[PDB]
Design a protein around this ligand. Structure first.
Ligand SMILES: CC(=O)SCCNC(=O)CCNC(=O)[C@H](O)C(C)(C)COP(=O)(O)OP(=O)(O)OC[C@H]1O[C@@H](n2cnc3c(N)ncnc32)[C@H](O)[C@@H]1OP(=O)(O)O
Ligand SMILES: CC(=O)SCCNC(=O)CCNC(=O)[C@H](O)C(C)(C)COP(=O)(O)OP(=O)(O)OC[C@H]1O[C@@H](n2cnc3c(N)ncnc32)[C@H](O)[C@@H]1OP(=O)(O)O
Ligand SMILES: CC(=O)SCCNC(=O)CCNC(=O)[C@H](O)C(C)(C)COP(=O)(O)OP(=O)(O)OC[C@H]1O[C@@H](n2cnc3c(N)ncnc32)[C@H](O)[C@@H]1OP(=O)(O)O
Ligand SMILES: CC(=O)SCCNC(=O)CCNC(=O)[C@H](O)C(C)(C)COP(=O)(O)OP(=O)(O)OC[C@H]1O[C@@H](n2cnc3c(N)ncnc32)[C@H](O)[C@@H]1OP(=O)(O)O
Ligand SMILES: CC(=O)SCCNC(=O)CCNC(=O)[C@H](O)C(C)(C)COP(=O)(O)OP(=O)(O)OC[C@H]1O[C@@H](n2cnc3c(N)ncnc32)[C@H](O)[C@@H]1OP(=O)(O)O
Ligand SMILES: COc1cc(C=O)ccc1O
Lengths: 247, 251, 240, 245, 245, 247
């Protein structure tokens, strides 16, 4: 994995795969290059047995500062309209299509700045711990666009109706304690203890049968979309599928 | 003096829509309903108005549906009159209001009961007075919550707490309303107007069409799957770029 | 109702029907027998004018320690066994005719979460312990357990407790929104009763419309609900 | 109602309110005037006990040639955005917001051309009889737009998946017989028999209790959206609402 | 044997085919609450009976079912709460147990099918009728909208325009029209009804029962789910089938 | 030239029409994990290729497709790691409907022959379909001892009536091209000798449309099925306006 990707670094320690967004000089802004590389990282790590749990984090002071306004636009305008379709799909592909129902447990370790488009993979990640010192913001409004991709849904899934509208509509920033209070993350802790808390959580997840864990996490995310009567069918099916697959 | 039961004041781009039946604690009559439609429709076309703040005259925000004024009409006409009277209440309370073209803030200055919860939650954001008292009194009056009241709770207040207040009909204060997610914030009545106006000013700074796309998109995306939203939210983004004449000039 | 059921007791006092899960020796673990009796209990108390409100609680230290793992046959029996669990836990309970309160006096694990959340309201003891232990036993949550969490507990929290299987006490359950409130055990029965009596002062048909409407409206758009809620209100006025 | 509206006529006979789109010189294209008049028509006939069933039909050769290319699109598109959104909302308001769950039974009586945007109120009307000679078309694609407003959903509700995509994607026209065969309408008959057949259906409808008829038709259109288990609750509520009212 | 076991219903099993015979022919198999309760017991019993691999729901005499029993419902109902129970019992067998029943089910519609009979007709997986069978949603003419899951049964099997026509008019229709509309798989002469049904039952009996159950259930659920929801759901059913088989 | 490019598929473009030919006719175009991976590549490639205006999905030889490859797609995957199964299923879904159902360009299935089981997903993902009278269809899954996997049962639900769908799923009975057209599974059935001509005529019609506009129209229709009227008022107007932008 060393030197494999230009904009991401992967460090696998004893079952825990740290996936590190690695454009710290651009505050880990999500360029099309990065989107395409994160797709390869998630696919590759899915099939790597040494990666039992994934921790998504950022190099330097940012977690991610959102979409790369420059490189995204640079590539999009260099091509015909239909290029935008491909470029948008690639962002969705790693941010949540692969990530939201990922085969392996995932934890967002939010060490610093998290803006705009970063909310989608933040929520696609199963659980999330952040630094008190981290700063969040849905700054789309202040740039003259509504939240794009699945950002507004990420909010809708995790943060109350009123709170979600306040932050989307104002673009106002908030810290890690506020993010845990509003339910965006599981926990906010001082940055000095971020890695410790995250690793403790990752090892607790490593204790469980991966196939059983997958059945439980996926079934929970899906169940929110189904009625009780539909869930009776769906949730038992996931139960039974787990039993078949769990080996 | 355009409306009998509602006053509108526009200052620096903020339209204060003031429910104006204080003698009745701003209860919602069919007249009020009909006039609120006209108000929302009027203000929508008013380039001077960039944010709406929905508040009450006197001590109440609204004490809810005016039940005498409702029966006055419903029992003087055939069954089908009820259809029209309900459509009119819904029309301003949420059909126009929930997905309103312009940003909306409920400034809950006081009493908020019953049917008041629907326009409350229809309003995008809400700041109340600490001193405000809310309640879902419907149950003690012998009816389940009418109109969209129960959905308004569902959208903003946890399952357990929603059931509790619907089932018991117990009242709660602004702090507890903030706590449960019904409103954004609760502040002392003495600071309610200034707090709402600073929020309102923030919102006037935003591109209107873009704010519209953002707030509508959020409310609708709650109903859709992630994969349905991929399609819907990008559509709202692209629509916002077209309709905003405007410009989006970050870039 | 004395002596009527092997694994449950019903005790009615002045409109309040206490339904007491009664296998203390196995921490009120839910067996096929218990499931069948609970169906009978629910159907009976429905038609009994003496029960105005049901409070679902547990004998001894447990509320319920979840499905009974010991209490094998042809494949088709599993269909019936699963259906019987569902039938009382939420098919009858979630939209029950009468107001229901869970009184969580102690241990609440696994499959207990389903009737916990089907119960309309819930008060628990500070000393009670809850957990979604499924994961530690090697199954995801069965039946309606995960949806039960989805309805009451935030996304992050739900996933945390489901994925880790970590236990939490009464105060945390109230803070998460799992139950309405947590009181010391010493005051659980009194606080529960005060709530029950409050609900007993309502018109039952109206209360029913109100609590059914709210649970269903969560599933419907605002436009659907304009139709559905007014329908429930009018149905209420008919059934008076 | 004689001379009440500029672009629509209402002629009531024996409990049947014939609502006639009345711009035959513009093939009944739906302009902002017509849209606003149609709202007033719907609201008025709702409260008029003389009207027991509405028959939606068109003066001249057309049922409706769709939205007014000039007055609804071209003149508006250039004007204030906020007015555009209001104009769209007014089109919806009569075409389906009031019409799809209308208090009273509704029949579209499709005497001729039906294009584009006419498909929304077509499907909002409970039942529909067209003439064999009527021609239908989702011509939007050929005019450079996808179908606007609720037109696509009007198709989705009544015409199977492959046929809907076919007619939306090609914009090919189809006659009344094909319209009945695909499920867009209930029946197609020669134009010479259209009024008779439609009146006979209206008379059947007029024999039913209005409130019960409302509960049944509303309930059906809503139930398509709900699960069986949600429907147990909802449909029994509609039945009980019906008994109350 | 189940001979003489129930008052209003008969079960006769031949070679794995369980004929469930609605048996109040003097009352055209009207569904009283006694019949509803007995049907609950029948479904629960046949579920666990390995002799029964497929269930065929038919009616004694000239009716399949004339719908809900007017007299015996309106009788057994005061106190209000009793209606809750009676309505449940009706739903319990008609579709709560039946629609997602563990074994494959076939409606064999030999005659009259009205009103409330539509719920179990469509809960049954497949259906064959006689050309001579007559159907109608007479609820409108009795002054109630269709109750229970009747309107959804229609919504699942019959096109939008046709369902509204029949619901709003209450008009009757024969076996051939029932098949044309999609309400049943096939209409055949009465003399061929039993053997066609049996031929189909024999085909179903040849399948792996657990697999058949996954397949029929997953189809009916998938109608309610989006494609992305069904990727998850349908693989879960497949994998569940592989476990349980 | 796409000549020689993929092992198990061919692309031939004539005048804006990209014929995508499933090409294992000696295996009746059974869909192996190789063919699935390659079809993902084909669709991403053709999406960005302005020479391709409309895709026609068809089979070499006597088959359209005989369904998933029992040997390469089921048997051999079953012998592999569990986590591999996850990727294999995803890669089948990826070309069959995740890219294909809302594909950017118009699609037509040209069903020249056998179409079984797994075939039904990409059959209905394709916007339009013409088949030969001589083609034979079947949901054979039940007779191999599985329920329909992947999206097959949803493909049937979207296109074929409730009664007919259960009948064919439950019995496993085959049916011909005319009956496929009658049931709503395809748009039309013609003799095989005319299949190509009729398909190209349709494709030529489709190529006259503004692609961005055609895309909005077919996508909006598919999605509107899932939404209520009030929802569609929002969504369908968003599609119309997005179209006016990108157009
Ligand atoms: C669609 C959406 O995602 S909307 C969200 C878009 N992103 C944002 O609104 C956040 C934008 N960035 C910021 O607010 C600031 O960069 C912060 C708070 C993240 C960091 O502040 P600072 O520590 O003062 O660093 P600074 O602003 O100098 O940025 C460092 C470099 O990162 C670049 N950068 C930061 N964020 C982005 C971004 N989203 N896209 C592209 N470049 C970025 C900066 O332009 C700067 O470039 P340069 O020094 O090579 O010219
Ligand atoms: C499908 C689902 O519901 S997920 C499973 C959810 N439930 C659980 O994880 C709980 C399992 N049980 C426990 O963890 C413990 O019994 C506790 C914490 C509830 C209480 O523990 P203690 O106070 O130490 O008492 P203890 O464990 O000895 O319980 C005594 C009896 O209860 C029985 N019991 C408790 N829960 C269950 C159960 N869920 N199934 C079967 N038996 C149970 C024990 O087997 C034991 O039986 P015995 O006396 O014949 O040997
Ligand atoms: C979303 C939408 O609704 S997109 C638009 C969809 N509508 C259509 O495609 C139909 C367009 N119209 C036509 O194709 C034809 O007019 C037909 C087939 C209906 C009738 O054809 P003809 O009998 O030959 O009449 P003709 O085309 O000359 O129209 C006669 C008058 O009606 C007008 N007219 C017809 N349709 C419309 C329309 N949709 N909007 C505005 N005016 C219309 C014509 O402009 C002409 O008026 P004018 O001479 O004052 O300019
Ligand atoms: C809620 C719902 O399901 S809506 C009610 C649905 N049913 C209907 O609309 C039709 C009711 N019945 C009929 O129309 C006719 O009985 C038919 C067409 C089924 C058969 O007609 P006929 O063969 O001429 O027989 P007839 O009308 O004499 O009925 C025979 C007996 O069955 C009884 N019966 C038939 N249907 C019902 C019913 N739904 N409920 C109670 N009794 C019924 C009749 O009252 C009659 O009783 P009797 O001889 O003991 O006095
Ligand atoms: C979920 C799913 O998709 S399960 C798969 C469902 N598919 C089916 O039920 C169809 C299976 N195939 C058949 O029934 C037949 O092969 C038919 C009707 C399509 C064509 O029959 P024929 O013309 O007699 O050709 P035949 O059966 O000899 O097939 C030719 C070769 O294709 C292979 N083949 C055909 N279908 C498949 C398939 N689905 N998977 C793997 N290999 C296949 C055969 O094994 C044979 O291989 P061989 O020559 O290497 O031994
Ligand atoms: C496209 O993948 C699959 C298709 C099928 C069709 O029956 C079954 C299992 C699968 O994995």
């Amino acid at each position: 994995y060393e030197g494999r990707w230009k904009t991401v670094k992967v460090e696998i320690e004893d079952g825990i795969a740290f996936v590190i967004l690695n454009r710290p000089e651009k505050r880990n802004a999500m360029s099309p290059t990065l989107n395409r590389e994160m797709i390869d990282v998630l696919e590759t790590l899915e099939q790597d047995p040494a990666a039992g749990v994934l921790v998504l984090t950022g190099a330097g002071e940012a977690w991610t500062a959102g979409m790369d306004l420059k490189e995204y636009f640079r590539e999009v305008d260099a091509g015909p309209e239909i290029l935008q379709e491909k470029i948008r799909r690639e962002a969705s592909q790693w941010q949540w299509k692969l990530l939201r129902m990922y085969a392996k447990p995932t934890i967002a370790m939010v060490n610093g700045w998290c803006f705009g488009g970063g909310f989608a993979p933040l929520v696609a990640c199963d659980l999330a711990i952040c630094a008190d010192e981290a700063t969040f913001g849905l700054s789309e409004i202040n740039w003259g666009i509504p939240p794009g991709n699945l950002v507004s849904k990420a909010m809708a899934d995790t943060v109350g109706h009123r709170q979600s509208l306040y932050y989307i509509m104002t673009g106002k920033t908030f810290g890690g304690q506020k993010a845990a209070e509003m339910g965006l993350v599981n926990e906010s802790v001082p940055l000095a203890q971020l890695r410790e808390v995250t690793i403790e959580l990752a090892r607790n997840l490593l204790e469980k049968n991966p196939v059983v864990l997958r059945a439980a996490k996926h079934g929970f995310k899906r169940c929110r979309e189904l009625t009780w009567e539909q869930n009776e069918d769906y949730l038992y099916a996931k139960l039974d599928q787990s039993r078949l697959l769990d080996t």
